Amino acid sequence: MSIGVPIKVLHEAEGHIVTCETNTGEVYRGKLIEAEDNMNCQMSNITVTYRDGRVAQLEQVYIRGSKIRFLILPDMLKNAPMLK
Template sequence: MTSTIGIPIKLLNEATLLEAEDNMNCQLRDITVTARDGRVSHLDQVYIRGSHVRYFIVPDMLRNAPMFRARNVRGRGVGLARGRATVNRARGQRGGPRG
């Protein structure tokens, strides 16, 4: 899969994405790098920390990929996620016993 990644100093064009993590750390190979002054260079492999990634441009074919389709979540309830402390505060009570 060929993609483009923008980082603060340079623009990586036509790289093959090997791996991408949840925090946007990514490994690339066969990279074409275009500097701000227009110089083009080629790299074999690169690892980019996710905090330095500004954007990804991926192929349009991923738009319809089944792995990115929303899943229907049923039978999970309302999802208020209230803990014991919130319920006790609503009743006017202090925190529960310790220990």
Template sequence: MAVTGKRGVGIPTILLHDGEGTIVSIEMKTGETYRGLLDETEDNMNCVMKDAVRTDINGNTTQVEQVYLRGSQILFIVFPDIYPLQPHFYIFSRIGLLLQLLVALTFRVADSLVLLLLWLQSTLKHAPMFKRVKMWKKHKGAIPTLGQGGVGGGAPRGQAAAIIRKAQERRGGF
């Protein structure tokens, strides 16, 4: 896993690398699906699968010994069910750690999977990655653009405000 520059890799890339050696299903943008052993992955989502079954749009299947899949052509990847419990999804705060301890204790009690699912649902519901979805629902699909009463509301902020201010100064305004 090569990381260049100042950017790190995100959770999807980490999960992709963790999935090496497992049986996965990959759907391509063309509609083809591949199901087989995920042998090798790269940071740009390029994948090498072994002993895969290729299913085209018409449903015809072909056994493929080894196949290279270009990452930009991948639509989605289906991993085994063990991956929602990966530590990459945990929240590292005091409350998050207490909830994780509670979940670990409930795992030892029989038939307590419902509590775990409720906790996961409430934790993911407030995750920062869903802020855009909440804004989309709040504004019924017409999200105001940033810098013009967007997420924070009010006047332009940051770089947009600086550009507008400099343009007004050049015109003699202000």
């Protein structure tokens, strides 16, 4: 009644390797440490593909969830209990 299913799947994706695209086209693949009700994602050990194609290694990242276009989660969470 209060919290939705996709934020439960986002909380279920913590510890896993998620790849989050942001509003400025930058793709961040790495270990999602923590995520909140708003989609503020503290992630770590991040491989970053910018818009040009350059890849950087940013070891501790906190993305503001407003700017997140989407996150690609592991398909393990296709069997997560809140997706039933």
